[PDB]
């Protein structure tokens, strides 16, 4: 009967950068999703496989909750099967993803008049990613021609990049926080219900 925390996932100050998204193994709950409509008017609340109007009365199992923060015009790459620099290098959902993608505007929280140089993404990599797997290693990207011997600059590139997140950018570049729930629905024990 104890409502397991969505507030420590949603209503938190620090959201992690997109190359290391958080994982909160949420289980043994009696979870009701009435709290999700009070916190913010959502920019994009899309679900895949279950409708939001019947989302309360099911009974899930192995529900995950992730968290990161990305740009404005590339929040639509957090979806099954999209292609870009986000969905191949930082966060890829599988093609049979069956949860819900929540993303609201957060320009007041995560934007300075100086450069908010904490939120970073990975831009260059050897190959693409598997679904649901992140890379946090900061080894130098080879440009493909000759070895750099761990030297940044020419013949190579430093694999990360920073966001600006200034309020004078506009709606396309101010930061959006993204919470993506991942139900692995219809298995045996079914510990989470409503």
């Amino acid at each position, epitope marked *: 009967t104890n409502l397991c925390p969505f507030d420590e996932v949603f209503n*938190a*100050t*620090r959201f992690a950068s997109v190359y290391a998204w958080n994982r909160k193994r949420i289980s043994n709950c009696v979870a009701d999703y009435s709290v999700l409509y009070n916190f913010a008017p959502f920019f994009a609340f899309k679900c895949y496989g279950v409708s939001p109007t019947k989302l309360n009365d099911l009974c899930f199992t192995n529900v995950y909750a992730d968290s990161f923060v990305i740009r404005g015009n590339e929040v639509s790459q957090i979806a099954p099967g999209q292609t870009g620099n986000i969905a191949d290098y930082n966060y890829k959902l599988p093609d049979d993803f069956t949860g819900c993608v929540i993303a609201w505007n957060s320009n*007041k*929280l*995560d*934007s*300075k*008049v*100086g450069g*908010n140089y*904490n939120y970073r993404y990975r831009l260059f990599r050897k190959s693409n990613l598997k679904p649901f797997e992140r890379d946090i290693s900061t080894e130098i990207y080879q440009a493909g021609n000759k070895p750099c011997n761990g030297v940044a600059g020419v013949n190579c590139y430093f694999p990360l990049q920073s966001y600006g997140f200034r*309020p004078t950018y506009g709606v396309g570049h101010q930061p959006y926080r993204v919470v993506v729930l991942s139900f692995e629905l219809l298995h045996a024990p079914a510990t989470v219900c409503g």
Partner: antibody, heavy 125, light 107 residues
Framework: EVQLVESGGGLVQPGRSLRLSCAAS????????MHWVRQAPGKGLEWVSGTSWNSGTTGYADSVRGRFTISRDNAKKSLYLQMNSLGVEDTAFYYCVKDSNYDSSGYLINNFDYWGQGILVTVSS | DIQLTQSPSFLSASVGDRVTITCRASQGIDKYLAWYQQKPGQAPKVLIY???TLHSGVPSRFSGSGSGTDFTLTISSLQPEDFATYYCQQLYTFPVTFGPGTKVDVR
């Protein structure tokens, strides 16, 4: 609620050194920032120092620049301010003040939310 | 850097009156400014952040307005607990600086 107890205040002589301390209890310390603000007995408020969630961006005022140094230690839920080469003008109540947003002054949602009781460090001798 | 000035420097208002306090900066700081209140002998507390949004716990009679360089703080119905001084605080960038102070005494 929010409980911020501070210690280290005492009568000292000019030219000495001392370390201020501030414990925290009742919130998540590493997610919120911290600052220090002093208030003279005759004057108003004046911002002393500021630190980030992980000491990423720290800045001081131009008056106490160099003489003071802040540090963050998330293990003990504590806060440290070290003052060196004090003058007679620094007799004030130092409030260990909890910020609200994660990092600093620039973000719109910044407000010095909870303020400690404050301790007087009086240096005249 | 940035300098904050307050006008007026003193007031004397009775119970039920309306008070306006002004606050100006040397440049445009773009709404990143707060307002605080200190009764003598205790700790200060938050009233309004970003000049238009109140913090939780205080009543809704408190309100601020304005943007750009000049800011106003007004209370429609003054109360006997509100007899204290009020400080500005700018929040554009480091270093943070405050206002000189305007106190509210009895009339």
């Amino acid at each position: 609620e929010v409980q911020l107890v501070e210690s280290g205040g005492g009568l000292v002589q000019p030219g000495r050194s001392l370390r201020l301390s501030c414990a925290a209890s009742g919130f998540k310390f590493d997610d919120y920032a911290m600052h220090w603000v002093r208030q003279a007995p005759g004057k108003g408020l004046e911002w002393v120092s500021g630190t980030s969630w992980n000491s990423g961006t720290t800045g001081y005022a131009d008056s106490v620049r160099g003489r003071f140094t802040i540090s963050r230690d998330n293990a003990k839920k504590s806060l440290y301010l070290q003052m060196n080469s004090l003058g007679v003008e620094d007799t004030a109540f130092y409030y260990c003040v909890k910020d609200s947003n994660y990092d600093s002054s620039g973000y719109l949602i910044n407000n010095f939310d909870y303020w400690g009781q404050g301790i007087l460090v009086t240096v005249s001798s | 850097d940035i300098q904050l000035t307050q006008s007026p420097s003193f007031l004397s208002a009775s119970v039920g009156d309306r008070v306006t306090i002004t606050c100006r900066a040397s440049q445009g700081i773009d709404k990143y400014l707060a307002w605080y209140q200190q009764k003598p002998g205790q700790a200060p507390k938050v009233l309004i952040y970003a000049a238009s949004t109140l913090h939780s716990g205080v009543p809704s009679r408190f309100s601020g307005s304005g943007s750009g360089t000049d800011f106003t703080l007004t209370i429609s119905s003054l109360q006997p607990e509100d007899f204290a001084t009020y400080y500005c605080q700018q929040l554009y960038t480091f270093p943070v600086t405050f206002g000189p102070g305007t106190k509210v005494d009895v009339r």
